RNA sequence: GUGGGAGAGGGUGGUGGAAUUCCCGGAGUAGCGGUGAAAUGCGCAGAUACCGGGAGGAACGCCGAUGGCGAAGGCAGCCACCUGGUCCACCCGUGACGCUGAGGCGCGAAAGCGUGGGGAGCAAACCGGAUUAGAUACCCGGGUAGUCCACGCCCUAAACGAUGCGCGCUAGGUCUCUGGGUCUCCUGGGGGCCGAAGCUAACGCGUUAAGCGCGCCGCCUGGGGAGUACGGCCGCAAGGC
């Protein structure tokens, strides 16, 4: 109902899940998916297979709004982070470029005990 | 009196009425703190490396002065008061250290 | 690979206002290059790092950038 | 701080003769001036502890020289102390 | 003394971006999160993920080092003011003015205490979920004191180089920080590594001595009982010598 036909895609990859949002060139999202949106429930969400299926679900939802050209943004390290990217180039959507924007602090906040 | 260098960056949207006023204000602020001006360099519109005050550009100024040292921190306090003024960095002058000479 | 000092001129290591030369010492990101890549000396790199940080506050050098690859 | 202008003014005042830079009177005259610069800096800045250590060494050095002048020529000692307002 | 030099040395004020949390709006559906698997939790009052705007506190990525400074504790954004120590070149001045140091005084990470602020993230106690034979724990979700600031106490430590300080003497090689020099190098002052002689029970040390000497202070005399009891001093308390 929008006919955007060009926009951005954000891959948020963690060790517990990989989720994909698709937005217009201004950042406002169109659709999205994740490892939990598809059938997977538990630890299977942070797997490269789930990361692939989640990427492909969003890419087919964006076809309904008419998306052809996509710019990709990647945040976080985790299993299936690369598998989502590879799933996106072959999704039919011509991938314009790929950027890594993973936020790193300048050593500002104290991490949880796990991360120290 | 030591010798310093003044970096002033202000909003790159001012017309000449506001540009003359803002600068003759900077003149008035240096007279009241006792800064003998040695030379001036005005760059103007310059592309910034990141947004400052939501604005992608900045209008740059540079003065080399000689003034009493005790009054420096108060001089910086007087220049930042103006809304149009954005960056005020004052650095004590140094010798031009050459590398690969 | 070549080093930065190896391919450059006679420049002022203390000038924070010359962005054209200081851009050569930042990486693809806004990060400061290691000594192994800049080809500077102990005293030189310490001076460069300080004039870089100054240019960063003047909005002339970036604090951080975005990598286009991967 | 202490510029060489103010520095020369004190040495020419307490020199036993033209050209003397290292007399005991000159050192104590020099030490006593840096004492007053620091004690006024430590009236404010009461939390500057690492500068307070240098002041202890300057006083001990000043007393060490005064204890020396005392033994050799006790007259110039009284002439020095009355001229600096110490003890 | 003069002239130079380097530095997260200290104190004060100011200041910059990244990120976290929270608020506001835009956009947008069904879960996010988390683990060896999970569950409490959060989510239709619209979360997570994305864009813009605002607030607040704390800590400084790359530079960054096997590095530098400091007497030790300890000291990392940037700028300015006040400021301490130290090193080299000149061989100018004073003329043994030196070394150590029982007491005394001052400093002293973290935690803890008092008064008043502040409170984003983390997080004793505690509240839950798991695990387990049991879980008063490791793992997960929350969370108060506290961590931050001001002023005043507290005086402990693996406060470690488990090596008190100062000086002289005794092969070198190599890496390095910083000065000066007639700048393949020489010469100082720090920081590492191999190793002569020699020492050591051995591991190891070896011009930064644990070598050869000298001066002064501290301290030791089997383990448990025990840094306990008593006494004293200090402390608001905890507790310290
Ligand atoms: Mg999971
Ligand atoms: Mg302003
Ligand atoms: Mg400092
Ligand atoms: Mg400081
Ligand atoms: Mg909202
Ligand atoms: Mg519920
Ligand atoms: Mg609910
Ligand atoms: Mg509910
Ligand atoms: Mg608040
Ligand atoms: Mg590092
Ligand atoms: Mg040292
Ligand atoms: Mg100094
Ligand atoms: Mg002589
Ligand atoms: Mg003589
Ligand atoms: Mg001593
Ligand atoms: Mg004592
Ligand atoms: Mg303490
Ligand atoms: Mg504490
Ligand atoms: Mg308290
Ligand atoms: Mg927590
Ligand atoms: Mg917890
Ligand atoms: Mg068991
Ligand atoms: Mg149970
Ligand atoms: Mg809370
Ligand atoms: Mg001994
Ligand atoms: Mg040289
Ligand atoms: Mg050496
Ligand atoms: Mg042997
Ligand atoms: Mg050895
Ligand atoms: Mg020795
Ligand atoms: Mg022995
Ligand atoms: Mg004893
Ligand atoms: Mg016994
Ligand atoms: Mg005890
Ligand atoms: Mg008794
Ligand atoms: Mg008792
Ligand atoms: Mg009592
Ligand atoms: Mg005890």
Helix (H, G, I), strand (E, B) or coil at C13: coil
Is the CB of residue D79 less than 8 Å from the CB of residue D66? no
Give the distance from residue A74's alpha carbon to the nearest chain C alpha carbon, in angstroms: 9
The residue to which tokens 């900045």 are assigned: B58
Residue of C nearest to B60 (CA): C58
Give the distance from residue C70's alpha carbon to the nearest chain A alpha carbon, in angstroms: 7
- Domains in chain A and their CATH numbers? 6-115 (3.30.420.80)
The residue to which tokens 């003065």 are assigned: B63
CA of B99 to the centre of ligand 32 (A): 59
Instruction: Find the helix or strand (DSSP H, E) in which C31 lies.
Output: none
Is the CB of residue D80 less than 8 Å from the CB of residue D67? no
The CA distance from B91 to C2, in Å, is 33
Q: Helix, strand, coil proportions of chain B in percent (round to 5)?
A: 30, 50, 25
The CA distance from A79 to D20, in Å, is 79
Indicate the DSSP class of residue D58.
Answer: H
Is the CB of residue D23 less than 8 Å from the CB of residue D73? no
Is the CB of residue B91 less than 8 Å from the CB of residue B76? no
**For chain B, domain boundaries:** 1-97
Q: Is the CB of D53 under 7 A from strand E?
A: yes
CA of A56 to the centre of ligand 7 (A): 29
Helix (H, G, I), strand (E, B) or coil at D42: coil
**For chain C, domain boundaries:** 1-70
SS3 string, B2-43, reads: EEEEEEEEECCCCCHHHHHHHHHHHHHHHHHHCCEEEEEEEE
List Cβ neighbours of A5 (8 Å cut-off, separation of 6 or more). Answer: A66, A67, A68, A69
The residue to which tokens 């909005």 are assigned: C59
Beta-strand pair A94-100/A69-75: parallel
The CA distance from A44 to A34, in Å, is 12
Question: Who among C8, C40, C59 is closest to B49 (CB)?
Answer: C59
B vs C, Cβ pairs < 8 A, gives 54
> For A108 and E125, how far is CA from C1' in angstroms?
27
Tokens of C7: 């391919």
Q: What's phi and psi for A86, nearest 5 deg?
A: -60, -35
- The angstrom resolution of this structure is 3.6
Tokens of D53: 């250590």
Instruction: For ligand 1, an ion, list residues with CB under 5 A.
Output: A 16, 43, 45
The CA distance from A3 to A93, in Å, is 15
Residues in chain A within 8 Å Cβ distance of C69:
98, 100
Dihedral angle over CA of A110, C46, C14, B23, nearest 10:
10
Q: Is the CB of A116 under 7 A from strand E?
A: no
> For A1 and E227, how far is CA from C1' in angstroms?
82
Q: What's phi and psi for A16, nearest 5 deg?
A: -105, -15
The CA distance from B67 to B52, in Å, is 29
The long-range contacts involving B79-85, CB below 8 angstroms and separated by at least 24 positions, are B79/B8, B79/B26, B79/B29, B82/B10, B82/B22, B82/B25, B84/B10, B84/B11, B84/B14, B84/B18, B84/B22, B85/B8, B85/B9, B85/B10, B85/B22
Is the CB of residue C16 less than 8 Å from the CB of residue C54? yes
Domain range for D15 is 1-87
Q: What is the CATH number of domain B1-97?
A: 3.30.70.60
Helix (H, G, I), strand (E, B) or coil at A74: strand
Is the CB of residue C49 less than 8 Å from the CB of residue C61? no
Q: Domain total for chain D?
A: 1
């Amino acid at each position: 109902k929008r006919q955007v036909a060009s926009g951005r895609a954000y891959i948020h990859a963690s060790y517990n899940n990989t989720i994909v949002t698709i937005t217009d060139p201004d950042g406002n999202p169109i659709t999205w998916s994740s490892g939990g949106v598809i059938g997977y429930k538990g630890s299977r969400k942070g797997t490269p297979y789930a990361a692939q299926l989640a990427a492909l679900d969003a890419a087919k939802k964006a076809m309904a709004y008419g998306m052809q050209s996509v710019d990709v943004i990647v945040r976080g390290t985790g299993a299936g982070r690369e598998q989502a990217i590879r799933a996106l180039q072959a999704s039919g959507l011509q991938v314009k470029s790929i950027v890594d924007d993973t936020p790193v602090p300048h050593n500002g906040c104290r991490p949880k005990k796990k991360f120290r | 009196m030591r010798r310093y260098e003044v970096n002033i960056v202000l909003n790159p949207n001012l017309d000449q009425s506001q540009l003359a006023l803002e600068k003759e204000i900077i003149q008035r602020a240096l007279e009241n703190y006792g800064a003998r001006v040695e030379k001036v360099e005005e760059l103007g519109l310059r592309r910034l490396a990141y947004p400052i005050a939501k604005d992608p550009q900045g209008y740059f100024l540079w003065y080399q002065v000689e003034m009493p040292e005790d009054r420096v921190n108060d001089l910086a306090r007087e220049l930042r008061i103006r809304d149009n003024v954005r960056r005020v960095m004052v650095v004590k002058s140094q010798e031009p250290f050459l590398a690969n000479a | 690979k070549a080093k930065v000092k190896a391919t450059l001129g006679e420049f002022d290591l203390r000038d924070y206002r010359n962005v054209e030369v200081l851009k050569r010492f930042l990486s693809e990101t806004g990060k400061i290059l290691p000594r192994r890549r800049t080809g500077l000396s102990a005293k030189e790199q310490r001076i460069l790092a300080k004039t870089i940080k100054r240019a960063r506050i003047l909005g002339l050098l970036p604090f951080t950038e975005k990598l286009v690859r991967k | 701080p202490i510029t060489k202008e103010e520095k020369q003014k004190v040495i020419q005042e307490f020199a036993r003769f033209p050209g003397d830079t290292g007399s005991t009177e000159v050192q104590v005259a020099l030490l006593t001036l840096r004492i007053n610069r620091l004690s006024e800096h430590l009236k404010v800045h009461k939390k500057d502890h690492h500068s307070h250590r240098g002041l202890l060494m300057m006083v001990g050095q000043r007393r060490r020289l005064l204890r020396y002048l005392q033994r050799e020529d006790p007259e110039r000692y009284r002439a020095l102390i009355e001229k600096l307002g110490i003890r």
